[PDB]
Amino acid sequence: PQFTAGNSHVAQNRRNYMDPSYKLEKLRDIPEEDIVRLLAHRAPGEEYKSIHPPLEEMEEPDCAVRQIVKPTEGAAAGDRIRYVQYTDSMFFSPITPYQRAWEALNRYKGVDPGVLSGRTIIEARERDIEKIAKIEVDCELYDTARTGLRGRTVHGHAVRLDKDGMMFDALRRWSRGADGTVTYVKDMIGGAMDKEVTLGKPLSDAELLKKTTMYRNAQGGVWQEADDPESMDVTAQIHWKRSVGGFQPWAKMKDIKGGKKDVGVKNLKLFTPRGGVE
Amino acid sequence: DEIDLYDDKGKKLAAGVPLQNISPLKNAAIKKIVNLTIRTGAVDLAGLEKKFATGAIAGRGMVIRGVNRNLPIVDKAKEIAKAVEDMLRVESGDDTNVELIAGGKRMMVQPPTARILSDYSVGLTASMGALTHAIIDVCNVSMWDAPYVHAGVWGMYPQNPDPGDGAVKMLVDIPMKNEGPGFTLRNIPVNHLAATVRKRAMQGAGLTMILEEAAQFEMGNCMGPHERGHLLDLAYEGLNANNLLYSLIKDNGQDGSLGDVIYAAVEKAKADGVIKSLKKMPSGFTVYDADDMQLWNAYACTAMLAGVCVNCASMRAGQPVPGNIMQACCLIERETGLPGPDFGMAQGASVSSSFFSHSIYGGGGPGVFYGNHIVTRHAKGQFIPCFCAAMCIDADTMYFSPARTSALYGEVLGAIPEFAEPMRAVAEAAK
Amino acid sequence: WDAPYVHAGVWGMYPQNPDPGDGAVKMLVDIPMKNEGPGFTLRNIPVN
Amino acid sequence: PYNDIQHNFLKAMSDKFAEKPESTATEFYTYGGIAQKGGMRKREFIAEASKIVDSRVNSTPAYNPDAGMPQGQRYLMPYMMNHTDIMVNADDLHWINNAAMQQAWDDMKRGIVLGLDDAHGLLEARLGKEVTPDTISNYMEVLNHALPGGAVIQEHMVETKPMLVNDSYAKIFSGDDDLVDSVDRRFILDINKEFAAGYDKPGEQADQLKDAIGKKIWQILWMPTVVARQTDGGTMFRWVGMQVGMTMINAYKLCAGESVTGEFAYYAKHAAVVQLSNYMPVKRARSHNEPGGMPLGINADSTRSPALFPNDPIRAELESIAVAAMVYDQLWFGTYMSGGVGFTQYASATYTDNILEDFCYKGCEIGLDYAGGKMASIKGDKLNMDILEEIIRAENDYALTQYEAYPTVAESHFGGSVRACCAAAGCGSAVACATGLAQPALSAWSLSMLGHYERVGRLGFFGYDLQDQCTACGSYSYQSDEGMPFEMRGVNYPNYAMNVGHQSAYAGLVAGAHSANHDAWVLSPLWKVAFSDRDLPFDRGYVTREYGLGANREYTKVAGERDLIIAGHYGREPGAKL
Amino acid sequence: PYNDIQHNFLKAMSDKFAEKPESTATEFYTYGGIAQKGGMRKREFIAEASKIVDSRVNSTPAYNPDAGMPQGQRYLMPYMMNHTDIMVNADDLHWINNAAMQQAWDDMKRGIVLGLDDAHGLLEARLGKEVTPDTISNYMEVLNHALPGGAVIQEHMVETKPMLVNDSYAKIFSGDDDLVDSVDRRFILDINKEFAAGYDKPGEQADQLKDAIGKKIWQILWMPTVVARQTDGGTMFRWVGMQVGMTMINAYKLCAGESVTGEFAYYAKHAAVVQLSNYMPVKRARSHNEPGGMPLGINADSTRSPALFPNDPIRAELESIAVAAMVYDQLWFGTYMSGGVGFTQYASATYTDNILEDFCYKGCEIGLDYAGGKMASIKGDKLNMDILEEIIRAENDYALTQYEAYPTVAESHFGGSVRACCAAAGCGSAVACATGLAQPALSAWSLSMLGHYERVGRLGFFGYDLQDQCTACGSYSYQSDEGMPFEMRGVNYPNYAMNVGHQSAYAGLVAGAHSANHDAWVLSPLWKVAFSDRDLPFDRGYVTREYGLGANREYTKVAGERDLIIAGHYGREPGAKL
Ligand code: M43
Ligand SMILES: C[C@@H](OP(=O)(O)O)[C@H](NC(=O)CCCCCCS)C(=O)O
Ligand SMILES: O=S(=O)(O)CCS
Ligand SMILES: O=S(=O)(O)CCS
Ligand SMILES: [Ca+2]
Ligand SMILES: [Cl-]
């Protein structure tokens, strides 16, 4: 597939994170039981609750779709539906909220992702969501400074960073060691855990610039319009085709008075410097 | 324009069907489905009997002491049912129908089409008027007691404009609760529809899209060339035209993701010549255009529904549908540089329904939405059928499920052949 | 660019206003929301 | 008059007029207009108006009797609050001039009842989460911080100044005594304690209530007065949904915004909610929780008389009447549906001078006489048209005779509208006490009105007898919009939808029948319990007393004022007083 | 940022944060929670809660951060009112804590416009009665006694206390200069005086208005604030009906209640009335004159900025925005349609810190740049998608860069929803200034939001972009409920009906196009004139300044308080202070 448009490394990051054929780099290896601790829907070693009998010991509606779509393992077992939630700093988080949903719904079977500015939640059957949490906490989409596991009190994505480059957390779920190592000392909703969970050191600024999916005209990020005109070129095109269609769905752009001459524009001028500070 | 119609198992039902043949304005099956939808009431006589005996004859949390009467309506169920039928009849052999169900605990009422002169809400009123006189006459209720019967049957009406606390239950609502002229057939909860097709997803989507598109006509949205786009959406998304819908689900149902369906749909659109290169961007990315935008929209809407079915059926749960529709639209746009289903309106409704199914502010799970709902009304017919599909697929993971909210409809409306097999009904009539 | 003006002229303040009465098409009867109950359709017709 | 002065009009008439209550003549044109004692407020108003004109940029004029109708060519009479010894100025009964009246209706408007059991069932069904009396206690504590406008989850939230919203809080009640014992008592509205009233033994009322409610838990939530005042009644169920929503997230450690949150919204806003009233047909477009959609029975259940005076069905009528006169006539018909000077005396006639009090106590006496001294004994096989007609004609003659033989009483009730209302209310009362049944009270209403026109040759104002002429027909009708049990009616019941001088009485009759029937409520056991809440500003047990305090400006219970956040008032200049 | 600090965000950022505006780092966890300056109100609120608990019968708890979310792990920041030097506490922007915001909306709600010409026409047709400037002058004098609750016909009427209703009066305006000259000037709202503003010469705005209005006579009547607060907006047209009814009877010597009186009712309540807004579909059931039915253009026309600063289209935008944020977001979405802590900062983001101010002035600059320095020149054959796209992409990059480059700005606008609202408003302003046309502002809105999601990887809250994804489609649609001109939209336009962070900006865009277009109003010449009335309590020409005074409790113009008729307040014990 094409996935998305864009000519810059940020656009390629987007395409990779969306691409199931692309294997995401692993930065850490959090043990499953520590994952369970962090989510705090259950205690490690505790058996999965059921909201209904396993599908196999049940007669389903005579539905063609149920017939041809395999349930996930969590669904087959009748697991509860629980969730994992991340907050992504505007300061070059490796992945951004919208791209999380693109990633999730391309890569995973049977998920319910929701995108907001300061939180992205994914819901799925409990055992399924535990597996997704590990994958997403382990890999390059989670930075221990610019990403946070937060099921409530998410404030901070747009707040300035602290001295060490950590994103603000009002519940203080994390603790930072002298060597930069980040440990979670509370669960993802700020509850007490029986033990601390080490996540690891933050990526460097250069690495963050390299890995991020955001365009950001500050602190050396990619300047969308100056560095990647293709990006808005194609987004604008979508915009105008929706515009024409709402008026008359059958209409072609060429039949419109003052319609676009082409994709893109000839005379876009910018009114900020690179890095924006003046 | 021509399409082939296929059933929920990928088997062809009709070929070379002119697009007009499945129009709500012309298809006898659709017209019948509409007619049944406004005429057919369901009554829980056992519960009504209990209302009278306990004085619980008003609204929620209300009880009137001292007006308890024991009226053997379930006992005399056969007499009541016949009195009603005779009152509803306008002429012998007409389409009047009344049936007792579950040993007379429950009753179906269908006033004849002829009693509806102007106002579709006669389906409710004729039944309510007939039922209360039936009870009074059959159970020999005295003048003094007559008003309690009115309350049992009509609820809080007229003090409350909504007779919802009363005895006769319809799929549709009273005219006042409709959000605009022509919204009549939109005011039908997803859970009621899901119950009605007995939780078979494609029948639910189909039935729901047949009602939505009929409403679209009634709203005035299908005049002139605008019509074609709606008929294409209905045929492809709702009726599995040329097996695109079933095919997308079948091909991805084992280990496919939502994105997989979307991309498979883009590739089919290309193969079928629906979309073609417009311009190649510096990165190599190709923006596509479509000579026939309405047809592309039909293909996109089908992609949308198929993506919803695949993901929700994987989870065997309904809650994913709004976020599914959102990324379906978003991703199909990013893949092609063309506009998503209903030119952005479907994505819009997916945002609001995502919000109002995961927040404190209103809505609920998908089963409490419907085409008339302020949250989900925005798309021009293509959106709500996905919801019904999702709540059919739901394995009772949700609290407000059709089993909880809509059992009565499943039981009473479930055996109506046009409701049970809407696609075959349409395909037959389109021949 | 000009199409919305034509909508205003024909549909009135609708949908912002539930009542399209400012619009261009005049019926004897009214919109369903303004009926005082189910079955009242044919009653919503001014004597004048 | 009634034999006992605590209920007859003889003290009011005596203290209002110089001459005897049965006097037939008086003196006019010699009071000096508003120079007289009853012109005191109007003098006060003239003095104010001058300062108002001074502050206006083009000196637009304001209150000026000379530009209108100057008052007091006759005696400007004071009023006595029913079953009190409190005299008030006529002007001080206008709802605008009376903060107690305003609070009584704001208290009703800002209430919402919400089931809790559905929430517990949802927690269990979807999450398997434990619900205990301790979690419920914690839930209610969080709720009582959140509901008035306190933050429970987010950082950097603004919050409400508590003294601006100090009338907002939440309690729970339940028919399950064992659950009530287990929950922190600070959150309990205790049915056993508010309803220890009985007829044959202590706590019968509680018994009736707990049986009807069963082992269920219900919340009563009161939103801030200032919220009702700034917005409307439609805010209330929504406000509950929001803050119960926030509380649930906190109390049960959920995601702050997951699918379960969404179902909690539907639970709180639709599935388990109990409102004061639904909306209105759009000609009279109104939000939820407004007077237009509030049934008569709910008005009655909002009063505490039946719990405080279990053996006094007529006090229960008159207290319900006083709330209803003010809500339905002064506010709803006199403002919501019209405005201006309004309908103060159309209303106050039913709660002043002990005149309606007199008729209704006599009516009950007559009803009992005809019931062989057995209250509420006329029903079933004993209910017939003959004995009703007999009861009605007897009371109707007693009441209409009072206005004729004691002309001060008619001078007080100077418009035939309130005379009709009151005579009919008395007749309805007689039938109430005789039958313990509301519906037959309508037969008494119809017959009283028709008999009144027939006897006196006049009735009420131009359009007074719309519903009265409809009453016989709608009495026992079961047609679509024409029939309804009395308790369930209101001002959306079609022929009730326009006129003063009726609903006041109706609220009484509905209370009368059920108090005489020894019923602990009229329509809603849930609203009955909620309104017993002793933390409400306005005293729902002593309604006419509260009105009297408000009239004389001695009322200390108004909520929702903004004095704490302003430096002055519009039209009033700041700076120290000499 | 914008070159001129009077409109840029640099003074606000400088005065809010210790670090530089472009700083990327700060310090957390060291403020002592609410011990910090910005915790002052919360400490105040804690001290009050204790008293509230002490007053309750079972000690039901109230405000308690420890039972919710304690505040201030981060800096609790103050805000600067847009285009002022007024700093405020965040807590003081909540509508409940701010009497100026309350008065702003009450003033709008209590207004009704009513033509007089039809009444004269009726007087002539049925009675052959002469109408002269003198009789009109007498009529207005009587009306100004009657409207607030004074009697004009009947004996023994109760009346309202003028200081409780001192904000109620009526004026007339007309395009007929000779009529205006002839009428007693105390009753005139003078168009030539309130609209002396012009562009190429004095009085052009007046000219526009008088041409649109013509030789007609219109009344603006304001009802008492306390009436809005006790009841709802549905009262307003009815109240005008009643008191205009009574005035007609007096000023024209009619029978007090004949057939002509009936036709005067229909004339007043239907035939010639102009309301603020119509009712709502019943899910969100509401009376007339509430925010749900109020079009955006009326919101805009209610501000005075265009008559006070005719060459400053962005000030017009920002003043309309300030009214709209508070009305649509804080009150309507944040209360009428939800409640609780609500939506203070969703709103205040658009009227504080000069952030939206900065974007919109830069926007106008960019749009003018593309319009060759000729404001409003991009119309007709010059109007196309290419130039729009160039304008929108330029300004969108400008505004989104500000949040990224000056992180204090993002920290102030911490929720993506307000960043989106403001970037999009900036784009809309750019198009408004270039085109002088509202509809194309929607094209900028759509592209800005889509460009935002695309650039940043995120947008607003969970359901922020419902209307935004619909925007392109609804742009130029003519389908039933899907299309309509921007000016006429409001929160009953379907996809507009649920969400914060839009209607604020929209009110601005609709004003900007028109001020740039040298139009004296947006939608309604009648409401434009009415709201120019300088006797209104809230200053509709200096909105953000008023909000600032309300915040700091320095506001002196609140109406409708009841301090004059009470001896105390609920929850506050009487007795002298020590
Ligand atoms: C200026 S802007 C701002 C405003 C504000 C806010 N809100 Ni919210 N909410 C509310 C509203 C708010 C506002 C305030 C103002 O000021 O305006 C309110 C306030 C409502 C009421 N109830 O009142 C509330 C709160 C309060 C407390 O805390 O309690 C609730 C809760 C909730 N809602 C829902 O539904 C869901 C929820 C829960 C949730 C939670 C969260 C956490 O966890 O933290 C959430 N949400 C999420 C979110 C978000 C979204 C996105 O992201 O975009 C956001 C935030 C972010 C950060 O960073 O901070 C937001 C916001 C914003 O934005 N939100
Ligand atoms: C959707 C609908 O809720 P229901 O689905 O009917 O519960 C609607 N709420 C409002 O849209 C909430 C708007 C304000 C809160 C959200 C702010 S973004 C209403 O109560 O009428
Ligand atoms: O119009 S009437 O004269 O009938 C009485 C209104 S108070
Ligand atoms: O539900 S959301 O978290 O999107 C925001 C509502 S404030
Ligand atoms: Ca109010
Ligand atoms: Cl005049």
What CATH number does the domain located at E6-108 have? 3.90.390.10
Ligand 2 atom with the shortest distance to the CA of D242 = 15
Q: Which two tokens stand for residue D527?
A: 């609203």
Q: Which two tokens stand for residue E144?
A: 């100004």
**One of B361, B370, B399, B409 is an active-site residue; which one?**
B361
Report which secondary-structure segment, H or E, holds B300. Answer: helix B293-315
Contact E223, E112 (CB under 8 A): yes
Residue E528, helix vs strand vs coil: helix
Farthest CA pair distance, chain A = 68
Helix axes E439-456, E466-475, angle to 10 degrees: 140
Query: Which ligand approaches the C-alpha of residue E280 most closely?
Result: 2
Contact A185, A196 (CB under 8 A): yes
E342: left (phi over 0), alpha (psi -120 to 50) or beta: left
Q: Does B66 touch chain C (CB under 8 A)?
A: no
Q: Is B359 in the pocket of ligand 4 (CB under 6 A)?
A: yes
Instruction: Please confirm whether the linkage preceding E148 is cis (ω < 30° from 0).
Output: no
Residue to mutate, A117, A150, A159, ligand 1, most ligand atoms under 8 Å from C-beta: A117
Nearest CA residue ID for atom 4, ligand 3: D462
Could you give the CA distance from residue D21 to residue E185 in angstroms, rounded to a whole number?
52
Mutate to test the interface with D, among E63, E250, E534 (most CBs of D within 10 A): E63
Q: Does D282 touch chain C (CB under 8 A)?
A: yes
Nearest CA residue ID for atom 7, ligand 3: D461
Torsion angles phi and psi, residue B250, rounded to 5 = -55, -50
Domain D290-524 has CATH 3.40.50.2000: no
Please answer yes or no on whether C38 and B175 come within 8 Å at the CB atom: yes
Query: Which ligand approaches the C-alpha of residue E134 most closely?
Result: 6
Cα end-to-end distance, chain B, whole Å? 15
Q: Where are the domains of chain A?
A: 1-278
Q: Is E216 exposed, middle or buried (0-12, 13-18, 19+ CB in 10 A)?
A: middle
Q: Is E340 in the pocket of ligand 4 (CB under 6 A)?
A: no
Half-sphere exposure of D294 (CA within 13 A, CB side): 26
Could you give the CA distance from residue D441 to residue D374 in angstroms, rounded to a whole number?
17
Helix axes E355-370, E416-435, angle to 10 degrees: 30
Could you give the CA distance from residue E331 to residue E339 in angstroms, rounded to a whole number?
9
DSSP for chain A?
------SSHHHHHHHHHH-TTSPPPB-----HHHHHHHH-SS-TTPPPPBSS--GGGS-----HHHHHSPPPHHHHHTB-EEEEEEEE-TTT-SS-HHHHHHHHHHH-SS-EEEE-SS-EEEEEEHHHHHHHHHHHHHBTT--TTTEEE-SS----TTSPB-TTSPPP-TT--EEE-TTS-EEEEE-TTS-EEEEEEEEEPPPPHHHHHHH-----SSTT---HHHH-HHHHHHHHHHHHHHHHHHH-TT--GGGSTT--SSSS-S-----S-TT---
User: Taking Cα atoms as reference points, which of D164, D107, D534, D185 lies closest to residue E63?
Assistant: D164
Could you give the CA distance from residue B292 to residue B236 in angstroms, rounded to a whole number?
15
User: Taking Cα atoms as reference points, which of D288, B373, E323 lies closest to residue E331?
Assistant: E323
Please identify among residues 317-356 of chain E the ones whose CB lies closer than 8 Å to any CB of chain B: 338
Domain B40-184 has CATH 3.90.226.10: no
Q: Is A183 exposed, middle or buried (0-12, 13-18, 19+ CB in 10 A)?
A: middle
Identity of the residue numbered D123: L
Could you give the CA distance from residue D230 to residue D162 in angstroms, rounded to a whole number?
17
D422 CA to centre of ligand 5 in angstroms: 31
E253 CA to centre of ligand 6 in angstroms: 12
User: CA-based Rg of chain C, rounded to a whole angstrom?
Assistant: 13
Could you give the CA distance from residue E133 to residue D20 in angstroms, rounded to a whole number?
52
Could you give the CA distance from residue E403 to residue D135 in angstroms, rounded to a whole number?
43
Query: Which ligand approaches the C-alpha of residue D265 most closely?
Result: 2
Name residue D170's beta-bridge partners: D221
Please identify among residues 349-408 of chain D the ones whose CB lies closer than 8 Å to any CB of chain B: 383
B137 CA to centre of ligand 1 in angstroms: 58
Ligand 4 atom with the shortest distance to the CA of E464 = 4
Please answer yes or no on whether A161 and E24 come within 8 Å at the CB atom: yes
DSSP type of residue E441: H
Q: Is A116 in the pocket of ligand 4 (CB under 6 A)?
A: yes
Contact D450, D530 (CB under 8 A): no
Please answer yes or no on whether C38 and B174 come within 8 Å at the CB atom: yes
Measured CA to CA in angstroms, residue D159 lies from A28, D348, D563, E117, E496 at distances of 41, 41, 18, 49, 27
Cα end-to-end distance, chain E, whole Å? 54
Q: Which of B9, B316, B338 sits opposite A71 (nearest CB)?
A: B316
Could you give the CA distance from residue D404 to residue A199 in angstroms, rounded to a whole number?
93
Mutate to test the interface with B, among C19, C25, C35 (most CBs of B within 10 A): C35
Ligand 2 atom with the shortest distance to the CA of B375 = 1
- Residues of chain E in contact with residue A261, where contact means CB-CB under 8 angstroms, are 386
Contact B136, B146 (CB under 8 A): yes
Ligand 4 atom with the shortest distance to the CA of E343 = 7
Could you give the CA distance from residue A138 to residue A140 in angstroms, rounded to a whole number?
7
* Chains in contact with chain D (at least 3 beta-carbon pairs closer than 8 A): A, B, C, E
Contact E325, E308 (CB under 8 A): no
User: Taking Cα atoms as reference points, which of B262, B164, B235 lies closest to residue B14?
Assistant: B235
User: Taking Cα atoms as reference points, which of B186, B370, B313, B335 lies closest to residue B263?
Assistant: B335
User: Taking Cα atoms as reference points, which of E449, E433, E429, E392 lies closest to residue E506?
Assistant: E429
* Residues contacting residue E246 through CB under 8 Å, at least 6 positions apart: D340, E146, E152, E153
DSSP type of residue D169: E
Residues lining ion ligand 6 (Cβ < 5 A) are E 136, 139
Could you give the CA distance from residue D329 to residue D348 in angstroms, rounded to a whole number?
9
Please identify among residues 1-48 of chain C the ones whose CB lies closer than 8 Å to any CB of chain B: 14-15, 18, 20, 29, 31-33, 35, 37-42
Method by which this entry was solved? X-ray
Report which secondary-structure segment, H or E, holds D304. Answer: none
- Residues of chain C in contact with residue E490, where contact means CB-CB under 8 angstroms, are 16
**One of E499, E506, E517, E560 is an active-site residue; which one?**
E499
E244 CA to centre of ligand 3 in angstroms: 15
CA B418 to chain A, closest CA, distance in angstroms equals: 17
User: Taking Cα atoms as reference points, which of E196, E179, E195, E197 lies closest to residue E187?
Assistant: E179
E225 CA to centre of ligand 5 in angstroms: 10
Q: Is E32 exposed, middle or buried (0-12, 13-18, 19+ CB in 10 A)?
A: exposed
Residues A1-278, CATH architecture: Alpha-Beta Complex (3.90)
* Residues contacting residue B304 through CB under 8 Å, at least 6 positions apart: B237, B325, B328, B329, B332, B341, B346, B382, B386
| Residue E374: Cβ within 10 Å count | 10
CA B219 to chain A, closest CA, distance in angstroms equals: 16
Beta-sheet strand order (sheet of A174-176): A174-176, A182-186, A192-200
Contact E518, E199 (CB under 8 A): yes
Extended beta strands in C1-48, E state:
none
Contact B284, B227 (CB under 8 A): no
Name residue A175's beta-bridge partners: A183
DSSP for B183-225?
-GGG---HHHHHHHTTT-HHHHHHHHHHHHHHHHHHHTTTSTT
D160 CA to centre of ligand 1 in angstroms: 16
**Residue entry with tokens 């324009």:** B1
* Residues contacting residue D66 through CB under 8 Å, at least 6 positions apart: none
Does the annotation list B166 as a binding residue? no
Identity of the residue numbered A183: T
Measured CA to CA in angstroms, residue A222 lies from A142, A210, A219, A275, D408 at distances of 20, 10, 9, 9, 91
Nearest CA residue ID for atom 3, ligand 2: B362
Contact B327, A113 (CB under 8 A): yes
**One of E58, E154, E384, E479 is an active-site residue; which one?**
E154
* Residues contacting residue B86 through CB under 8 Å, at least 6 positions apart: none
Stretch(es) of chain D classified as CATH 3.90.390.10: 6-108
Mutate to test the interface with A, among E393, E408, E443, E500 (most CBs of A within 10 A): E393
Q: Which of B246, B282, B327 sits opposite A102 (nearest CB)?
A: B327
Do the bridges between strand E217-222 and strand E111-115 make them parallel or antiparallel, or are there none, so unpaired? Answer: antiparallel
What CATH number does the domain located at D109-289 have? 3.30.70.470
The size of chain C, in residues, is 48
Contact E449, E402 (CB under 8 A): no
User: CA-based Rg of chain B, rounded to a whole angstrom?
Assistant: 23
Does the annotation list E215 as a binding residue? no
Torsion angles phi and psi, residue D10, rounded to 5 = -70, -30
Instruction: Please confirm whether the linkage preceding C15 is cis (ω < 30° from 0).
Output: yes
CA C42 to chain B, closest CA, distance in angstroms equals: 7
Annotation says E499 is catalytic? yes
Assigned CATH class of B1-39+185-431: mainly alpha
Measured CA to CA in angstroms, residue A52 lies from A84, B4, B130, D131 at distances of 22, 39, 42, 20
Do the bridges between strand B276-280 and strand B168-169 make them parallel or antiparallel, or are there none, so unpaired? Answer: unpaired
- Using a 6 Å CB cutoff, which residues line ligand 1? A 116-119, 152-158; B 359-361; D 151-154, 157-158, 242-243, 246, 249, 256-257; E 69, 340-346, 349, 414-418, 460-461
Q: Does D276 touch chain B (CB under 8 A)?
A: no
CA D546 to chain B, closest CA, distance in angstroms equals: 28
* Residues contacting residue D241 through CB under 8 Å, at least 6 positions apart: B360, B361, B362, D265, D268, D269, D273, E338
Contact E277, E490 (CB under 8 A): yes
Q: Does B399 touch chain A (CB under 8 A)?
A: no
DSSP type of residue B238: I
Could you give the CA distance from residue D24 to residue D11 in angstroms, rounded to a whole number?
18
- Residues of chain D in contact with residue C34, where contact means CB-CB under 8 angstroms, are 282-283
